[PDB]
Amino acid sequence: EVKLLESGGGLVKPGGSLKLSCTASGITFSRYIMSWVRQIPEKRLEWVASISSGGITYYPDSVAGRFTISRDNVRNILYLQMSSLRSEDTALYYCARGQGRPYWGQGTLVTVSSAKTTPPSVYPAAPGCGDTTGSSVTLGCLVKGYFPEPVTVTWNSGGSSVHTFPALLQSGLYTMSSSVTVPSSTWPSTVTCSVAHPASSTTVDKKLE
Amino acid sequence: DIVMTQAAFSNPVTLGTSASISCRSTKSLLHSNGITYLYWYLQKPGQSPQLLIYQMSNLASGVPNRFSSSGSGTDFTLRISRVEAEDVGVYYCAQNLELPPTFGGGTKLEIKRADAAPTVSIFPPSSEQLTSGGASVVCFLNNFYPKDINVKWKIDGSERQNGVLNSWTDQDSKDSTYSMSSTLTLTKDEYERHNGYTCEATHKTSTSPIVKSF
Ligand SMILES: O=C(O)CCCC(=O)Nc1ccc(/C=C/c2ccccc2)cc1
Known part of the structure; x- marks a missing residue:
C-alpha cells in the first residue's frame, strides 16, 4: 500500500x-x-x-x-x-x-x-406533548459546551438520513446538533446517537426515549 | 509564484448532464519533459481532500472515467460527465511544477433539482438540560431546495430575534437538498416566564409559511 x-x-x-x-x-x-x-x-x-x-x-x-x-x-x-x-x-x-x-x-x-479542553454535553431531541407521532419522525441530539471543535456524531452506525450541522462557537465553546429521520413503524426499536470527542477522550451515548 | 485562478461557483448543473470547471495559471505548467504539472482535487464537507486527476490528464486511484481534464499549458477545464448527486463539493486546481506550491481558490459544484419544502421539527428544552439551568429550543428545517430560506422565532406571539443561532449544511450528497437548524438559547428562568414558542420557516417555494410551535 x-x-x-x-x-x-x-x-x-x-x-x-x-x-x-x-x-x-x-x-x-x-x-x-x-x-x-x-x-x-x-x-x-x-x-x-x-x-x-x-x-x-x-x-x-x-x-x-x-x-x-x-x-x-x-x-x-x-x-x-x-x-x-x-x-x-x-x-x-x-x-x-x-x-x-x-x-x-x-x-x-x-x-x-x-482555552481549556472541555467535554461535550449531549441532550436528546425527541417529540413530547402533541407531536406528529406518525410515519417518518425527526429525532436528534444537541451537543454543546465542548472544545476543541473536533466531535463526531454517529447513529447506530447505520445512519443514512442523518443531518449533522456545522458546529458554532459560543462564548468560547462549540455547539452543534444532529438530526435523524426514521419511519414511526420502527421508532420503538432503539435509536441511539453516539457522540465522540477524542479531545477529551469522551464518548457519550444517548438513547432517545 | 504561479497563481491559480478559478471562479468560486459554476452554474447549477442538472443531474445526468456535464459540468465544466475552468482554471488558469499565470505560467505554463507544460514541462520540458512533455508533462503538464496540473492536478485537480476534491473537497467534500466532512472529508479530507481527494485527488482526482494529476499530470493534467491522468486519473487518480478510484476515480471514475466520468472525470477528465483538458487544456493548454495555462488554461484548463475539468469536465464531469453525467453528474451524480454525490459529486457535490468544491473542486480545486493546483500546480506541482515548481515551488512554492500554489492552489486555486476552488470552485463549488452546484446541483440543480426540483424544489422542495422544508420538513420542520421543533423540540423544547430537554429535562436533562433544564436540570442544569440551561434552556435551548431547537427546530430543524430539513431537505429543502433552493438553499435560500429564512426562519423567524416568536415567543408568546412576540418576535424573539435575539439569542438565536442558525447553522446550514452544504448540498446533500444524496438528495441534493439543503438543511439547517435554528437554536434559540436562553436561561431556564427566561424560558419559564413564557409558554408557547414558535419556529417559523418562510421559504420561496410556497406562500404558506410552514410554522411549528408548542
Ligand atoms: O520538482 C519540483 O520542484 C516540483 C514539485 C514541487 C512540490 O513538491 N509541490 C507540491 C508540494 C506539496 C503539495 C501538497 C498538496 C496537498 C493537497 C491537498 C491536501 C494536502 C496537500 C502539492 C505540490
Whole structure:
C-alpha cells in the first residue's frame, strides 16, 4: 500500500512549541521534495515548508524562523518542529509528497490557544406533548459546551438520513446538533446517537426515549 | 509564484448532464519533459481532500472515467460527465511544477433539482438540560431546495430575534437538498416566564409559511 500518516497534533498555548511527525508506507522520503501544508477555517490550503532530496529547506515568510522541517532518511520520517506558535497557526497540517502524482495524509490538528479542553454535553431531541407521532419522525441530539471543535456524531452506525450541522462557537465553546429521520413503524426499536470527542477522550451515548 | 485562478461557483448543473470547471495559471505548467504539472482535487464537507486527476490528464486511484481534464499549458477545464448527486463539493486546481506550491481558490459544484419544502421539527428544552439551568429550543428545517430560506422565532406571539443561532449544511450528497437548524438559547428562568414558542420557516417555494410551535 501507499499512504502517509501525520501525527503529533493537539492543543498548544500561544508561544509554545510542538513537533509533528510523518511516516509512510510505499514512499521513500529521501528521494523527494517533501512538504507540509496546512488547512485553516477558510478551507484554502497554505504551504508551510518543503525540503528537497538534497536537504535544502524552503519556507514562506509566515513561518520562516519559527518552523523547521527535517527528515530522518534512515527511519523514513518527516518532521515539522514548530516554535513561538501563534493563534494564526491553528489548522489541520498535512504531510505531502507533491511531485508527480501528489500524495498526502489525513492530516493532524494543531490548536493554539489558552482555552481549556472541555467535554461535550449531549441532550436528546425527541417529540413530547402533541407531536406528529406518525410515519417518518425527526429525532436528534444537541451537543454543546465542548472544545476543541473536533466531535463526531454517529447513529447506530447505520445512519443514512442523518443531518449533522456545522458546529458554532459560543462564548468560547462549540455547539452543534444532529438530526435523524426514521419511519414511526420502527421508532420503538432503539435509536441511539453516539457522540465522540477524542479531545477529551469522551464518548457519550444517548438513547432517545 | 504561479497563481491559480478559478471562479468560486459554476452554474447549477442538472443531474445526468456535464459540468465544466475552468482554471488558469499565470505560467505554463507544460514541462520540458512533455508533462503538464496540473492536478485537480476534491473537497467534500466532512472529508479530507481527494485527488482526482494529476499530470493534467491522468486519473487518480478510484476515480471514475466520468472525470477528465483538458487544456493548454495555462488554461484548463475539468469536465464531469453525467453528474451524480454525490459529486457535490468544491473542486480545486493546483500546480506541482515548481515551488512554492500554489492552489486555486476552488470552485463549488452546484446541483440543480426540483424544489422542495422544508420538513420542520421543533423540540423544547430537554429535562436533562433544564436540570442544569440551561434552556435551548431547537427546530430543524430539513431537505429543502433552493438553499435560500429564512426562519423567524416568536415567543408568546412576540418576535424573539435575539439569542438565536442558525447553522446550514452544504448540498446533500444524496438528495441534493439543503438543511439547517435554528437554536434559540436562553436561561431556564427566561424560558419559564413564557409558554408557547414558535419556529417559523418562510421559504420561496410556497406562500404558506410552514410554522411549528408548542
Ligand atoms: O520538482 C519540483 O520542484 C516540483 C514539485 C514541487 C512540490 O513538491 N509541490 C507540491 C508540494 C506539496 C503539495 C501538497 C498538496 C496537498 C493537497 C491537498 C491536501 C494536502 C496537500 C502539492 C505540490
